[PDB]
Amino acid sequence: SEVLPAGLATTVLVPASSANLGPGFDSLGIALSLYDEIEVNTTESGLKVAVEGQGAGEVPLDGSHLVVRAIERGLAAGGAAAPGLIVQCHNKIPHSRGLGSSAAAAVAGLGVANGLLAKAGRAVLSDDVLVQLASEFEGHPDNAAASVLGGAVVSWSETTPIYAATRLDVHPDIKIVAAIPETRVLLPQAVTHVDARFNISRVALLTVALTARPDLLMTATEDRLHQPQRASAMPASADVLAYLRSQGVAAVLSGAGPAVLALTTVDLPDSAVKYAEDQGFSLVAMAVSAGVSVR
Amino acid sequence: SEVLPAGLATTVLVPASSANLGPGFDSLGIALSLYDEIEVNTTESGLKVAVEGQGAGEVPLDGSHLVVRAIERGLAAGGAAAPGLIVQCHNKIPHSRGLGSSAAAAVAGLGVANGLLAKAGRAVLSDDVLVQLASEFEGHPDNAAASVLGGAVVSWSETTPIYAATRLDVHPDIKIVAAIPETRVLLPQAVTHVDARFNISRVALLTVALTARPDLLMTATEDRLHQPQRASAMPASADVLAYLRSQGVAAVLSGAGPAVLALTTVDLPDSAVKYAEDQGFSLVAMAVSAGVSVR
Numbered sequence A, B: 001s002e003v004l005p006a007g008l009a010t011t012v013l014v015p016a017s018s019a020n021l022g023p024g025f026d027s028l029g030i031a032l033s034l035y036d037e038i039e040v041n042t043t044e045s046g047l048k049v050a051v052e053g054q055g056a057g058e059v060p061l062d063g064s065h066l067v068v069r070a071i072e073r074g075l076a077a078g079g080a081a082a083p084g085l086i087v088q089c090h091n092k093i094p095h096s097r098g099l100g101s102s103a104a105a106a107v108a109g110l111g112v113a114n115g116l117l118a119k120a121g122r123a124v125l126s127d128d129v130l131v132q133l134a135s136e137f138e139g140h141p142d143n144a145a146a147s148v149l150g151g152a153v154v155s156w157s158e159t160t161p162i163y164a165a166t167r168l169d170v171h172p173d174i175k176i177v178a179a180i181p182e183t184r185v186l187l188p189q190a191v192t193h194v195d196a197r198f199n200i201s202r203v204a205l206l207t208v209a210l211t212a213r214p215d216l217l218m219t220a221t222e223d224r225l226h227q228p229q230r231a232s233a234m235p236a237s238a239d240v241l242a243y244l245r246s247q248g249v250a251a252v253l254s255g256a257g258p259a260v261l262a263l264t265t266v267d268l269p270d271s272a273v274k275y276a277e278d279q280g281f282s283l284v285a286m287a288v289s290a291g292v293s294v295r
């Protein structure tokens, strides 16, 4: 496979994302305006990884770094190989918080591949290929499709599993606030038909509430297939979630938590802001973001 | 409650509907341009019921008739009562075929009440109340909401159960063909979490496919929670369903069957039309309908 020239550079901006959004377990995701920025240069030989910000000192500084793995996977998919790499990460996406830092790193590395391929005069990978490859790193497509495509996404799989997604236009009156604090619960293998039908009606309603009917966000963010089962092992997230919802705020777990996402139609009460902080949660307002950007 | 004057008349036209539409079990429905016509007059006393067409000779002609039940429930909800009634039905919605004749009957009777209330100068029942009351007759809101609201609907329940729905704007390139023939199974009590996540991703996708991306109808109409389990008890429906999908036609069970619905953007293959007929099914082309009409 054609070895890339040395001396190419590209910079990538990848957003955080929040999966599930209540009942949309393993399918729904939404891209948020909190970014990691990755700058990469091709060189004659070797690999240097530098990391500043979130996860600094917690991520590997070698070829096992998720971004580097994704760079190499994307290049291979594009029929190329890097002669050598310098990789600099400026991270603002918190790790292990439910905001999709692993998915963003894979999407970023694949974005870097598209940047390097283009500047070498080669074909880039289509968004569908980006979604496929990023989801393979995660094992499920919801965060990955969100970081690739932006907006809100409906993702799905076909079973070598195929991963795909489509982008929704989030209603402009919906504003997202993330409550971010400072092992995974085993989910039931089987669920009642009644509970499955419940989530079916709610996730179907959720795509409508995200796009056309923001007044239905409370009803559409109800869930019976993962949030109640996770509550006892993460009481403070469950407590903040319960409090926001009791105040009419459409609150959901950000993925598996512990962060909590509020899909708001009016600004949060000062009381709710104070309640979250008392539990240890910082409230960060975020806009729905576009997908990964490459230049 | 105010007794209505004798001598009022109203005519109601109610569409059939198709529930589930694949993975949207107990939530999704779509209104079809196949109508029952109900003419009602208030009289000094008594109850006279005449029925023509579908269901003629099999439905009760007394106060237990579903339309009459719905008229009186609606009038009572409207704070009124009929001194006497003449009810004549011209039915084209086949019964016991998966095309929502029971829900259509309740919606028609409730529409009749709104017609009589209006001509008596009283407030009519809101669409939300119509959906609530019709769904109470059915035990589920998907057929009822479709017949009330028209178009495609996402319906849901909250727990006296609350039944509600919201109307989707079906993509104009989507045209419906019903395979209508001339059997009972108890669905499984539990389903795997895996199968629930599957239907979750597909029903979320279906709302997008019905409204913006009809090219996704095949993927979005896949189901694991009721259609495969109903195949054995309705072999000919399952065969027509399986064959249409094998030919690239987004086919689903109409409700619980035995009718089969094709969600098409182009007319059916010359061959598939013949395969359905060979299996005993008449293929009827239908447009998405508006809701119940009252005059």
Ligand SMILES: Nc1ncnc2c1ncn2[C@@H]1O[C@H](COP(=O)(O)OP(=O)(O)NP(=O)(O)O)[C@@H](O)[C@H]1O
Residues within 6 Å of the ligand: A036, A055, A058, A059, A060, A065, A066, A067, A091, A094, A095, A096, A097, A098, A099, A100, A101, A102, A103, A105, A255, A256, A257, A258
């Ligand atoms: N930006 C990153 N760069 C490199 N490796 C990363 C990065 N983010 C995550 N990882 C790897 O994944 C680990 C954290 O994984 P994880 O707990 O899934 O966090 P997350 O994906 O950001 N949040 P969550 O939604 O809770 O899964 C790190 O210790 C790394 O091994």
Ligand SMILES: Nc1ncnc2c1ncn2[C@@H]1O[C@H](COP(=O)(O)OP(=O)(O)NP(=O)(O)O)[C@@H](O)[C@H]1O
Residues within 6 Å of the ligand: B036, B055, B058, B059, B060, B065, B066, B067, B091, B094, B095, B096, B097, B098, B099, B100, B101, B102, B103, B104, B105, B255, B256, B257, B258
């Ligand atoms: N238009 C109608 N007028 C009066 N009674 C009706 C009408 N439609 C259905 N019924 C009653 O409902 C019975 C048949 O119910 P059924 O056929 O199971 O309902 P359905 O709504 O057509 N079911 P499905 O379309 O298969 O989901 C009849 O024997 C009547 O008692």
Ligand SMILES: [Cl-]
Residues within 6 Å of the ligand: A233, A234, A235, A236, A237, A258
């Ligand atoms: Cl906790």
